[PDB]
Amino acid sequence: KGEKALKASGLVPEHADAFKKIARELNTYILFRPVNKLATNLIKSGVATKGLNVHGKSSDWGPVAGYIPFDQDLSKKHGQQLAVEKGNLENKKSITEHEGEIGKIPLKLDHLRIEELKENGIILKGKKEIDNGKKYYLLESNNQVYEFRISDENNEVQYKTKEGKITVLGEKFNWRNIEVMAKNVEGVLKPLTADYDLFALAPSLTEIKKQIPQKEWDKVVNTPNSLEKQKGVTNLLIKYGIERKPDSTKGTLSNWQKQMLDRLNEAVKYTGYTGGDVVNHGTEQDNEEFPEKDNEIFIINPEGEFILTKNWEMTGRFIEKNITGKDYLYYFNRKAKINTIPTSAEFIKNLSSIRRSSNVGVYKDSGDKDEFAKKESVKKIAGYLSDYYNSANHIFSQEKKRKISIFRGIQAYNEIENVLKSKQIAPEYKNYFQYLKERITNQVQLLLTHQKSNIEFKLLYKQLNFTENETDNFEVFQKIIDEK
């Protein structure tokens, strides 16, 4: 937190000041994932950010790294040489996937990066041998097994391993240029560096009132009881935010999220960033290739405070206290899962990920009555896990979101118990359902003990019996929970 936030985060300071300017002019409470200072100097130099095109991110070492490489030894597979062939294959399909707009331009080198990285002990002051017939600035890298040779007189990088050592790889790569990816912004090609990353946003209710047309907000003026407000915010979210297009250009967003991110990101056009959108993809919850546990997040408010958190459970504490605990909606990109679980889209993603290795189970590759019956059960299960995050009923206190979340979770639990009266299923999907039922009972119990009323869980499961209606049983749920 503070200037320690911006230095242990690793971002541009004047980008943060431009974000403060556009936040003071727009009033949106966005978040940021920290990107290191190895690529940040190249953001200040002029080469802009990548998108969601290559998902093997750049290393945390290397004076020539920061850009996404074709040979992924300059990526996170450092020393794990059996995966560098799959890295070359994945960057072959990353090249051949985004064709039409991509070119082949290498890194634009500078002498200033290696003098600003003198702290690694890059130059050994021993013998000065003229290798390859050229006056070379002799550098010794972080290790002896591979040297990352930046050129001195060539615009292209002349990186080449030594001609007297042997490794376990065997592919002594020649003095070629680096093969990093490209993107055509306003006609001129540009290399791609480590992209900036965000987490969420929580805009003010008058900004949503002025960004969504006025009829939906003259609806808000005549809302006496909270169930009609629940219906209004839910069908607003259905007619606006369910159109999540799975894309690989700018990130899995909606329309208004994209245009407000563009209006929040255009503030660097007069500061020194020649690209505009400094974040060209979604989050890491929106990057579905590898689930990265984000250890710390960067907090940006329109008031002007710089907070970088420490712990992940404390990050969820900050979210549920500042975002959800007050009158602000939690517009996040949608045994140890206490409060925030992977959402309904991630639920279907986990379902497919277990489905790819499980041949049989609950329902198989056919269309019978139990098959499509448990298919409609799991689509309404996904609907209930989606409506579990009904974080827009914040007109009264957080207890209202608590009781609505418990109502949706108990509907989900009754759906799970409706599913388990079927045929003899495979043990993979069986203990999948066991983990889901244990997680949902522990979540509903630890929310019930947090909120009110000291009731058991099985008591609330036994007293609640809903068959074909949910606007009547919310009254008996309110009669049990409230009005003691």
UniProtKB/Swiss-Prot annotation:
Enzyme's top EC category: lyase
Resulting phenotype, K229A: Great decrease in calmodulin binding
Binding site for Mg(2+): D195, D197, H281
One GO-annotated biological process of the protein: cAMP biosynthetic process
Record GO terms (molecular function): adenylate cyclase activator activity; adenylate cyclase activity; ATP binding; calcium- and calmodulin-responsive adenylate cyclase activity; calmodulin binding; metal ion binding; metallopeptidase activity; small molecule binding
Binding positions for 3',5'-cyclic AMP per the UniProt entry: T252, H281, G282, T283
Protein name per Swiss-Prot or TrEMBL: Calmodulin-sensitive adenylate cyclase
Species annotation: Bacillus anthracis
Gene that this polypeptide is encoded by: cya
Parent-protein start and end of this portion: 297 to 800 of 800
